[PDB]
Amino acid sequence: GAIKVGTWGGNGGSEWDMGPAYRIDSVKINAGDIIDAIEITFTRYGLTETQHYGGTGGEPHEIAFEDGEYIMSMEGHVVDYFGLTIIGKLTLTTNRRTFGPFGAYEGTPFSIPVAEGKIAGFFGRAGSFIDAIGVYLMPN
Amino acid sequence: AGAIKVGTWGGNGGSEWDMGPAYRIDSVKINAGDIIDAIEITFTRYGLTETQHYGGTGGEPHEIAFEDGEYIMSMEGHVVDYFGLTIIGKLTLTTNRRTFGPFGAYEGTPFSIPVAEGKIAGFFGRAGSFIDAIGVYLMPN
């Protein structure tokens, strides 16, 4: 019933799945050389929730979405990080702003620009880092 | 009408084209040599089956006729520099049963659309002599 695109990344870590949200309120990405973590605050069915995926490392970067602001694209790199296949660079683009790039490693690029509709949530794999990531797509 | 469109990947040249979403994709023909010259899709929507060709007249053709219950679940390829133009140099379509491609010989910046849940139901992009850019419509299964 859902539209899920991904994942991009490795087979390490544990599977995680935020599910789609009615509204994404804010995102925090922790990154150093690679993407350590992603945290999302979102609202659905009248309730707000915060979910954190990944480890404790990296410098934090946060965006609080404006009213009418939605995620239009995600892009990054799947990298080799000391033998691990993980997310090394990540950017989220909204209808108004660019959030990123964060991370310093490159490898195999991926990009998911949404010409019609929106990125409504995320899924992926994580342990100490973000091993893999994917998106839920919903109509606008 | 609540469509979900992802893309485009490719250059800014060529003229825009858009097949729209289809009820069923019947067949796809890709013409390729060094790069992706053309894509032709036969699809059904509202009791009508039609064929639309995008791109030029070059390259060798290859075709897939979809089986009953067969749907597209992935698209991947390369955005490349071809004599200074930025176009699609390699393309593959993967169904729940078969891999169609890869076609084309040039590499550059890879792109990939793995559909974990749902299907690719149509295409849009830019084209002139070749396929400058490509994108897809998505639907649930």
Author numbering:
A (entry chain A): 3 to 142
B (entry chain B): 2 to 142
How did the manuscript describe this experimental structure?
A BLAST protein sequence alignment search revealed a candidate lectin from Musa acuminata ssp. malaccensis, which we term Malayasian banana lectin (Malay BanLec). Like BanLec, Malay BanLec has a β-prism-I fold characteristic of the jacalin-related lectin family. To assess binding of WT versus F84T to HIV, we conducted surface plasmon resonance analysis to determine the binding times to, and binding avidities for, the gp140 trimer, which is made up of uncleaved ectodomains of the gp160 HIV envelope glycoprotein trimer. The results show that F84T and WT Malay BanLec, which like BanLec exist as dimers with two CBS per monomer, bind with high avidity to the gp140 trimer. That is, we asked whether disruption of pi–pi stacking in a structurally related but distinct (only 63% identical at the amino acid level) jacalin-related lectin, Malaysian banana lectin (Malay BanLec), would reduce mitogenicity of the engineered lectin without abolishing antiviral activity.
Between the two CBS, as in wild-type (WT) BanLec, Malay BanLec has a tyrosine at position 83 (Y83), but instead of a histidine at position 84 as in WT BanLec, Malay BanLec has a phenylalanine (F84). First, we aligned the structure of WT Malay BanLec to that of WT BanLec. The structures are remarkably similar, with a root-mean-square deviation (RMSD) between all atoms of only 0.517 Å. However, the aromatic rings involved in pi–pi stacking are arranged in a planar (sandwich) conformation in BanLec, whereas they are arranged in an edge-on conformation in Malay BanLec. Malay BanLec treatment resulted in greater BrdU incorporation than did WT BanLec treatment at concentrations up to 10 nM, but less incorporation above that concentration, which may be due to cell death triggered by excessive mitogenic stimulation. These results indicate that Malay BanLec is indeed mitogenic, and highly so as it is even more stimulatory than WT BanLec. Therefore, Malay BanLec, like WT and H84T BanLec, does possess antiviral activity and perhaps has more potent activity against certain strains of HIV than does either WT or H84T BanLec. We would expect Y83 and F84 in Malay BanLec to interact via pi–pi stacking. Thus, although Malay BanLec is quite a different lectin than BanLec with only 63% amino acid identity (differing at 52 of 141 amino acids), it is predicted to have important structural features in common with BanLec that make it a suitable candidate to engineer in a similar fashion, with a view to reducing mitogenicity while retaining antiviral activity.
